[model samples]
Target: PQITLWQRPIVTIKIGGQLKEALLNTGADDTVLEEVNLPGRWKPKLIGGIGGFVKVRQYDQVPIEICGHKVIGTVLVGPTPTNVIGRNLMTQIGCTLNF
Candidate 1:
């Protein structure tokens, strides 16, 4: 099955028992959340983007449900302009780019 990519590639995802819209970014290597209060150990990591770099909390083995598909992987929490579902998680959900 194939999914269409939108101008924003936004989708409703459930994370930490809360549902929110996140951008599906094929360009990103890791998923980034705006703000999620998770109970676990995390390490500080610096991530770079168009605007430069910022420190984020890196959590391993995070489960996020997107389009009814469960994806388990690393999740980064920081002050992102918007929540991003990166390639690491997107590929697991069978998402691909199409013109």
Candidate 2:
């Protein structure tokens, strides 16, 4: 399916058996969640963005579904303004720029 690159392209996704909303960010390299309930071992990771840098929980092989597309990879959890679907997961779901 084709996706429009709106100013803030939001998408509905499922993670940890729960429904959630996330922003599709091509500029990001990894997916990040505002918060999640997945219980497991995670490592501390430092990430930098427009605002600055912050520590996050790096969980490996986290399963998620975006518009029915199943993807399993790293999902970072931390104090984010919103959930972000980055290029790592976007590539698996066949997302690309139309122009």
Candidate 3:
């Protein structure tokens, strides 16, 4: 199935047997999860958002499944209270933005 970007491109995804909905942003450079309770080794990272250059944990090599497609990508852990599926993960799926 092909994903068409008409709205925000927000879709449901399963990561580690966990189901969550996030935005598939083609402009974003990385993927992020708002929960910091995830167990993994991560490094310090800073991403400038409306929340400012906030500090977060950059966890690498998280196996993920999006729209039934599985790919390994880096997932950042932080407190956005907002989850986003960025281009880094989307590129793994070979996704393209369609207006």
Candidate 4:
């Protein structure tokens, strides 16, 4: 499906049985989720955005259902402004930001 930038590209994604609305942010390099927990080990990492850099928990090999398409990849948990499915996850879903 072709998408336009007139409105935000937000879609429902399922992770750990939790359904959430996340933006498909083409400009973002990594996927970021706000206010979520996972029962596994994670690594601490830094991410830079609009304001500055912030700490995030990196969880690998996590499976997520994006609009019914399932894909396993890295997911970040932290205090992001909003839940965003970045290019990394986007590529797995074969989603390109072209018009």
Candidate 5:
């Protein structure tokens, strides 16, 4: 058996200026703005999804603080299912999955 473990970064972003925590999963390929309870002003756009490419327009990029590291283009917005993490966010962090 072979085992591999990676230490991923974690971030807290301000949704409407209120802090929310997010896990930085580089093993994914999409940016999922998870666990967000949004307001009426934030519109949810289907955007589009094909194969695995989802073009979500409802999300807004926010400045994220991870541990001590920071990223300026973290995606936000909600009504995302529990499995909110996706490939867009992963691309930013540079993630890869294999068998």
Candidate 6:
């Protein structure tokens, strides 16, 4: 089944083969990563705008259950902002920020 942001689980994600820990942002449009944390290879292709764009070289998706709720496609790999999660991974679960 699919779980919305509100129903989605909050988890820490690791990326870039570096295992960098990041907070999942179920409300963002695209995954974002800071220049500091961005992978050396992906930084050049960094995408911008609120339309959901992020810079990442690679990622390893991990599946996890949240609040005992089922959320498929929960595991995703991509760039991550310094301290926030983007819509890239969030949109998959659905947007409920209005609520």
lDDT tens digits, residue span 1-99, model 5? 121445434555455455666655555444566565544334445533655544443545655443333554445454344334455654444445657
Candidates in order have lDDT scores of: 0.86, 0.88, 0.81, 0.90, 0.48, 0.42
lDDT of 1 by residue, 37-83 (tens): 87788999999855778999999988889967888888899988999
Candidates 1 and 2: which is better by lDDT?
A: 2
Candidates' TM-scores? Answer: 0.87, 0.88, 0.83, 0.90, 0.42, 0.34
Top-lDDT structure, candidate number? 4
Q: How many backbone clashes are present in model 2?
A: 0
Residue 68's C-alpha lDDT in candidate 6?
Answer: 31
- Predicted structure with the largest TM-score when compared to the true one: 4
Per-residue lDDT over 1-99 for candidate 6, one digit per residue giving the tens place of the 0 to 100 score: 233555534455444334334445655554544333432332234455478765454432433232232333322234443545555555544534653
* Sequence-dependent TM-score of model 1: 0.87
lDDT of 4 by residue, 1-99 (tens): 677778998899999779999999989899999988876889999988558889999999899999889998899999888999998999999997553
What is candidate 4's local distance difference test score?
A: 0.90
Model 5 per-residue lDDT at 31: 55
Q: Could you arrange the candidates by lDDT from highest to lowest?
A: 4, 2, 1, 3, 5, 6
**Residue 55 lDDT, candidate 5, scale 0-100:** 42
Clashing pairs in 4: none
Candidate 3 local accuracy as lDDT?
Answer: 0.81
Off by over 4 Å in 2: 49-52
What's the C-alpha lDDT at position 67 in model 4?
82
Q: Stretches of candidate 1 above 4 Å error?
A: 49-52
lDDT of 3 at 19: 86
